[PDB]
Amino acid sequence: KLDKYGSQNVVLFLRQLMEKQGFWKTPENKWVTIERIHIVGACNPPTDPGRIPMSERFTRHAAILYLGYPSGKSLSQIYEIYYKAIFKLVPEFRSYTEPFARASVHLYNECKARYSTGLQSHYLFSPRELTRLVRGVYTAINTGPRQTLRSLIRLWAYEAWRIFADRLVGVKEKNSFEQLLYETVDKYLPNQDLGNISSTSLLFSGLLSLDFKEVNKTDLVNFIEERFKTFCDEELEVPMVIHESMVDHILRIDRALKQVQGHMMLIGASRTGKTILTRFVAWLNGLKIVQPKIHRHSNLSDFDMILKKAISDCSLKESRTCLIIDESNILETAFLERMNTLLANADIPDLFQGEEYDKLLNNLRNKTRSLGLLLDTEQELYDWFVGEIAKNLHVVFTICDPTNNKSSAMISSPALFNRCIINWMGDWDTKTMSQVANNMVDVIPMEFTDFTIRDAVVNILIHFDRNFYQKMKVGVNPRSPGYFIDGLRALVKLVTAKYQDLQENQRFVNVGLEKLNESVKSLTFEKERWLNTTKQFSKTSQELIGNCIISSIYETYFGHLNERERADMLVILKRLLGKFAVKYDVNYRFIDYLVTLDEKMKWLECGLDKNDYFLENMSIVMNSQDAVPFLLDPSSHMITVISNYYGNKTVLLSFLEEGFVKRLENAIRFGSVVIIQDGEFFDPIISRLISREFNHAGNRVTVEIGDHEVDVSGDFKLFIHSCDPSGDIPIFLRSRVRLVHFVTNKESIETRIFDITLTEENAEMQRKREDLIKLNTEYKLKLKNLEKRLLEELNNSQGNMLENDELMVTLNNLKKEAMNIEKKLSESEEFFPQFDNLVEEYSIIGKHSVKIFSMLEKFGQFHWFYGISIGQFLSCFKRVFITRVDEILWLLYQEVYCQFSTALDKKFKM
Amino acid sequence: SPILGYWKIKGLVQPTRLLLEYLEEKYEEHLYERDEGDKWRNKKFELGLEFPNLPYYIDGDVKLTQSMAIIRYIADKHNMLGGCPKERAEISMLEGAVLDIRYGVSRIAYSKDFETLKVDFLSKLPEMLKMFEDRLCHKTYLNGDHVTHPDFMLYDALDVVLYMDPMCLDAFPKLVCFKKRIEAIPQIDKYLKSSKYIAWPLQGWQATFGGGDHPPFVIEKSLNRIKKFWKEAQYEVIEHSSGLKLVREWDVLEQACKEDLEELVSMKASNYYKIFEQDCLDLESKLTKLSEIQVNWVEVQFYWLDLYGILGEN
C-alpha cells in the first residue's frame, strides 16, 4: 500500500535500484552501489481486487510480459503427463490416464465458470487446483490398497470434492457440483459401478487402516466415539454429539493436517464447533495445539513471542505444532502481515534478524549435527530450518463471520488464500439440527401423545429457529445455530425443574387424601370431593411440556427483542404449538409462570420499573444462568438493582480500568458477585470465563486467564453491563452471552398508552385487571398457606381435643376462598376476550402515536434543543382526556400540536 | 469371594482394592467406619491372623496382615512379580519408591506442624517425580508397556498428594499423563465410577493430613506468596552528588502494596476465611501502615530534591 497521500515507497525503492543502481543506507547514512543484482517481479492485473496501481516512474524500467491461462487444451495435455507419472503405481489402469486428465480439466473449467467471484469472493479457480487435485490423487494411491477402477474414480471424486467444493457456501452450489461430478464421470469414465458420489457417502481415511481406503460410515462413527471420550478425558473437558456433518468435516481437516504444508482456513459461523474439531483432529494427528493467548492489551511483541517460540520449537525441538488462529487474534494489520510471511515464505524473517539471527544460526548447527548431517554454508542451514517449519507447523484459521471487514482481510490476503484449504461450515443443516436436538432430549420426562412425542418437540424448535432468523435478523445468513442449542438446554433444565415440582404438589394432595379418609364430619366430605383438583392435575401435566417450550424460548430467543417483537414471535410459536400435538396453556403469562411472588417483591424493592417488559427481562437474567448475561441499559438504573440484590458481595468493575486484569482474579477466588460496567469493550481473556470452561482438580476448580490458572469459588457470579446499543460486542461473546435489553423504546409507548387510555375509557375493567392476576396468585398462595396451617395442627391436636375446629371455621372461611378462585376464573373467561377487544382500538391510537413520537424524536437529532422524552408524550396524552376513538385520536393530534409547538422555531413549527 | 478387614477409608487397602478391581474379581469387606472403633476392637484379637492388624485379608486359607504381604500375594497369584532377577528387582524398586510416598504422608500427617512440614516433603517430592518423568521417556509406564499393581499404589499416593498440592503434577507432565492413562484403563475407570467405591478420607479420620469428610482454601496458598514477597522487598538506592542516598523506582513496591491490600479486602467476601481471617487482619494493619508511610515518603523525597536544586547548591 501507499502513503495516505498515495505513494508506495517499497516500489520506489526498487525503482531506485533499477534506475540509480545503488541506494542510500537508511540508518548508517551512505551510498552503497549494488553490483550485479537483477529485479524481477510478478503481479496480478491491477483491475483485480486487492491490487494497487504502480507508478509509471517505476514500470518505465521494466519489460512487461502478460502470461495468461493456457489453452484448456494444453491443460488437458499437461495433466495427462501428470496422470502418466502417478499411474506407474496402478499400471493396470494406464489406459485410464487420458480420460482422467480430460475429466480433471473439465471439472476445473466448469467450477471456474459456475462458481465465480460474482457469487462469492473466494470463488477463484486456477490450474493450481488441478495440480492440487493431481497430487491429492497420487497421495491417496501411494498410500492405498490396490485399486479397482471403481476405487480410482471415487478416489478422484473425493479429491475433486475437497479441492473444488469444500469452499462452496450454501447448498444450491454444493448440489450443483454433485451433479457436475456426475455429469463429468458420465462423459469421460462411463461406469455403472459408481455409487452415491456426494461427500456424505464417500469417506476416505487412514484412521482405520494403515492404507488410505474408503471406509464404512458406521465403522468411522464408532471409531470417533471411542476416540472422543479419550480426547475428552485426556484434554480439556467438553462433551458433544457426533453427527453426519461432523464425520465428513473431521476427514477434511485430517487430510489437511496430514499434507506437508497444511493450512486450512475454516469458516464456521459460531458455535458450529469449528474450533473444537480442529483441536481434536490435531490431537489425532499428534500435533501440539498452540493457541495465541491475546487480549485488548496485547502488543505485536506478544504475538511475535508466541510465533517465535512455535517456530523455534518446530525446527530446533521438532515439536510438530498446530497453530489455531482465530479472527479475534488478529488485532492489528501487522498481526495478519506476520501470518502472511509464515505462509507464502515458510519463515518470519523479522523475528530472526541480526544477532538473533546469529543465535538462531548457531543453534541450527547444533541440532543439524545431532541428527547426523553437517551443512557447510549459511544458506544450506537456513533452508533446513525453513523446510522443517514447512512440514511441522500447521496453521488452522477459524473465522466466524467472513462478512466482517477484519475477517474479510484474512480471505482477501493472497498469502493466506493460496496456501490455505478453504472449508465451509457456515450453517447448521436441518438434518444436523434434528440429530443434535434428538440426543439432547434423549432424557425422557415425557409421556405418550396424539401425533411421536419427542420427534414433535424437536420439529417445533427447528421450525421456530428457522422462523426466528427469517423474521428478526437482517443480513444474509452469515450467522447460524447457537440459540437452538441453548434453547434445548433450557427446556431440559426447565422440564426437570417443573416435573419435580408437579409431582411434588401431586404428592401433597395424595398425602391429604390419606389424611381425610382416616378421619371419616359435616364439611370434610366436601374436601374429599376435591377430585376436581385431582382430576385437574392430568390436564396440568399435559401442558407442562409445551409450556416449557415457550418458557425456554423466552429465556433464550426473547431477551434482546422488542415489546411487539416478543409477542409476535410468540404467535408464530403458539401456532406451531397448535399444529403439533403438544398441549399448551392458552391463558399463559411468562412472568407469572416463572417468577415467584417472593422474587417479584424482591426485584421491585431494589427499584426495578413496574413495566411488564422490564419484569420479563429481569426474569430472563436471573432465572437462567447456564451462561453469562449481557445487560444493556442507557441509564444504569439496572446496575444498582443487581447491587441491592447481592449487597456487600457486589463488586463493580469495568473492562477499561487498569486493575481489572488482577481485580477479577481476586473476585473469582473469593466468590464475589461481579458486574462489568463497560460491555462494549471486552478483552479476550475473560473469554474462558464466558464459555463455561474449567480444569477440575483435587478439591479446586481452576480457570485459565491469559496465563495464570486461578481458582473459581462457585458463589462467584458474573454480569456484563453496557450503556450504548450502538456498541458492538465480539461474535465470540454475543453467542455465549444471554443478551437482555433494558431499553426504554418507542415500542414502550404503544404498550404504555393503552394502560392510560383504558383507565380513562373503561375504569372498571382496568382496575379489575390488576386484582384479577393479584388475587389469582394471592388466593392460590393463601390456599397453599392454609393447607400448611391445617396439616400442622392436625398432627399436633390428633390426640388432643378438636382444636382443628378452631381452624375449621377458618376453613369455613376458605369455602369462600377456594370458591372465590372458581368465581374469578369464571369471570376471567369473560374478561379476557373483552380486554382483547379493547386492545385493537387502542392499537389504532397506538400506531399513530409512535409515528408522532418518531417525528418529534427526529427533531432532536437535527437539533440539540429539540428534545422530547417519552414522559413528555405521556403527560401530553393524559391532557387529551382531562367515533369516540376517532375524536380521541384527533384530540391527540391537537394536544401534541398545542404543547410541543412552543419548543420549536417557526420553520420547525411548519 | 475373599474377605478384607480395614478402615472405611483409602488407608492401607486402596492399591489392593484397585488390583482386585483390575482382575474384575468381586470381594467382601469388614469396614470399620470413622466412629466404629468398637466393631474393630470387637474382632481385633478373635480372627486368627498370624499378625493381627489392619488390614487383614483371608481367602483360600491365606491368612494375611501387612499390606505388602497381601498385595504381593494377589500379584503373585497372577504371575506379576517378575520373570528374572532384574525384572523382579525392578518391580520391587517400584514397590519401594511408592511406599516412600504413601508412608512419607503418614509421618508428617501426625505432626502438629503440618502446613509447614509439607514444605520439606514437597521439596523432596520433585526429585522423586523427576526420576519417573525420565523413566517415562521412551516408555508408556515405568517398567514397560503395561501398567502393573505398583501403578495402583502410586495412584493412591497421587490421589492423596493432589490434596496437599494441586500443582504436584504441573512439574511432571509425563505423570499427569500416566495418571489420565490409569483412569482410562477399562476395569479401573468402571470401578471409580461404581457405587461400591467409598471415596474418602485418605488416612484414618484422626490424621491431620487427609483426615475428615472432604476438602473444604486458597487463602493459605495466597497469603504464603504475599508474606514471601514482603520478606525480599528491595529499593534501588542511589546516593546523589551530596551526602544523602535516594530511593529510585518507587512505583513497583508502591503498586504491589495497593494491589496486595486489595487482595486482603476481597478475602473478606469469602466464606472460609473467618478463623484464618484474624491473621490476615494483622497483615492488613501491617501494610496499611506501610502505605501510610509510602505516601508521605515519596512526597518528602520529591519536595526535598526540588528544593535542593534551589538552595542546596548556591
d(CA A652, CA A643): 9
d(CA A558, CA A738): 10
Give me the domain span that covers residue B73.
1-217
A228 close to A242: Cβ distance less than 8 angstroms: yes
All residues of chain B having their beta carbon less than 8 Å from the beta carbon of residue A711 are 217-218
CATH superfamily, domain A1-69+259-426, is P-loop containing nucleotide triphosphate hydrolases (3.40.50.300)
At residue A394, the 3 state secondary structure works out as: strand
Strands A717-722 and A673-676: parallel
- A670 and B183 in contact by Cβ < 8 A? no
H or E stretch including B252?
A: helix B251-266
Which of B 180-199 lie inside 8 A of A, CB atoms? 180, 183-184
- B270 and A711 in contact by Cβ < 8 A? no
A40 close to A50: Cβ distance less than 8 angstroms: no
Identify which of B214, B215, B270 has the shortest CB distance to residue A670: B270
What CATH number is given to the structural domain containing B115?
1.20.1050.130
Which residues lie below 8 Å from residue A760, measured CB to CB, with a gap of 6+?
A881, A882
- A713 and B270 in contact by Cβ < 8 A? yes
Which residues lie below 8 Å from residue A457, measured CB to CB, with a gap of 6+?
A441, A446, A491, A545, A549, A580, A582
The x, y and z cell numbers of residue A851, run together, are 409515528
Annotated binding site of A for ATP: 268-275
Any A CB within 8 A of B173 CB: no
All residues of chain A having their beta carbon less than 8 Å from the beta carbon of residue B263 are 666
d(CA A477, CA B217): 49
d(CA A607, CA A654): 23
- B259 and A667 in contact by Cβ < 8 A? no
Residue B60 DSSP one-character state: S
How many C-beta neighbours within 10 Å does residue A770 have?
Answer: 9
First-to-final CA distance of chain A: 52
The x, y and z cell numbers of residue A134, run together, are 493431481
H or E stretch including A420?
A: none
What are the Cα distances from residue A555, in Å, to A260, A485, A491, A621?
48, 12, 10, 8
Q: What CATH number matches the domain at A427-624+742-743+763-838, 1.20.920.20, 3.30.360.10, 3.40.470.10, 1.10.10.10?
A: 1.20.920.20
Core vs surface per residue A557-584: b (16+ CB within 10 A) or e = bbbbbbbeebeebbeebeebbeebebbb
d(CA A859, CA A907): 11
Residue B65's DSSP bridge partners are B56
CATH superfamily, domain A625-741, is P-loop containing nucleotide triphosphate hydrolases (3.40.50.300)
- B269 and A671 in contact by Cβ < 8 A? yes
Cα B111-B112-B114 angle, rounded to 5 deg? 70
Residue B308 DSSP one-character state: I
A290 close to A323: Cβ distance less than 8 angstroms: yes
Any B CB within 8 A of A659 CB: yes
Can you give A8-29 as a three-state secondary structure string? CHHHHHHHHHHHCCEEECCCCC
Shortest Cα–Cα distance, A698 to chain B (Å): 5
Which residues lie below 8 Å from residue A162, measured CB to CB, with a gap of 6+?
A136, A252, A255, A421
Among A538, A514, A507, which Cα is nearest to A528's?
A514
Any A CB within 8 A of B145 CB: no
Any B CB within 8 A of A663 CB: yes
d(CA A539, CA B108): 65
The x, y and z cell numbers of residue A428, run together, are 447448521
Which residues lie below 8 Å from residue A418, measured CB to CB, with a gap of 6+?
A128, A343, A344
* B54 labeled part of a ligand binding site: yes
d(CA A283, CA A99): 39
Any A CB within 8 A of B157 CB: no
The x, y and z cell numbers of residue A590, run together, are 411468562
In the CATH hierarchy, which top-level class contains the domain A70-258?
A: mainly alpha
Query: Which residue shows C-alpha cell 500500500?
Result: A1
**Residue A736 CA to its chain's centroid (Å):** 7
- A651 and B266 in contact by Cβ < 8 A? yes
d(CA A638, CA A618): 9
- A672 and B218 in contact by Cβ < 8 A? no
A161 close to A116: Cβ distance less than 8 angstroms: no
Query: Is the peptide bond prior to A634 cis by the omega test (within 30 degrees of 0)?
Result: no
Core vs surface per residue B15-54: b (16+ CB within 10 A) or e = bbbbbbbbeeeeeebbbbeeeeeeebeeeeeeeebeeeeb
Any B CB within 8 A of A671 CB: yes
Backbone angles phi, psi at A395, to 5 degrees: -100, 120
Identify which of B184, B215, B267 has the shortest CB distance to residue A699: B215
Identify which of A670, A697, A711 has the shortest CB distance to residue B266: A670
* B67 labeled part of a ligand binding site: yes
Single-letter code of the amino acid located at B297: W
B102 close to B159: Cβ distance less than 8 angstroms: no
Query: Which residue shows C-alpha cell 444493556?
Result: A632
Among A260, A257, A256, A282, which Cα is nearest to A387's?
A260
Interhelix angle for A430-440 vs A244-258, to 10°? 110
Q: How was this structure obtained?
A: X-ray
Q: What is the dihedral of CA B102, B104, B110, B113, to 10 degrees?
A: -140
- B218 and A669 in contact by Cβ < 8 A? yes
d(CA A216, CA A300): 47
All residues of chain B having their beta carbon less than 8 Å from the beta carbon of residue A669 are 218, 222, 266, 270
d(CA A220, CA A218): 5
- A670 and B269 in contact by Cβ < 8 A? yes
H or E stretch including B6?
A: strand B3-7
* B296 labeled part of a ligand binding site: no
Q: What is the dihedral of CA A654, A660, A666, A671, to 10 degrees?
A: 20
Residues of chain A with CATH 3.40.50.300: 1-69+259-426, 625-741
Length of chain A equals 910
Any B CB within 8 A of A235 CB: no
All residues of chain B having their beta carbon less than 8 Å from the beta carbon of residue A699 are 163, 166, 214-217
All residues of chain A having their beta carbon less than 8 Å from the beta carbon of residue B222 are 669
Task: Give me the CATH topology for the region A744-762+839-904.
Answer: Helicase, Ruva Protein; domain 3 (1.10.8)
Chain B residue with the nearest C-alpha to that of A668: B266
d(CA B110, CA A121): 72
A631 close to A742: Cβ distance less than 8 angstroms: yes
Residues of chain A with CATH 1.10.8.740: 744-762+839-904
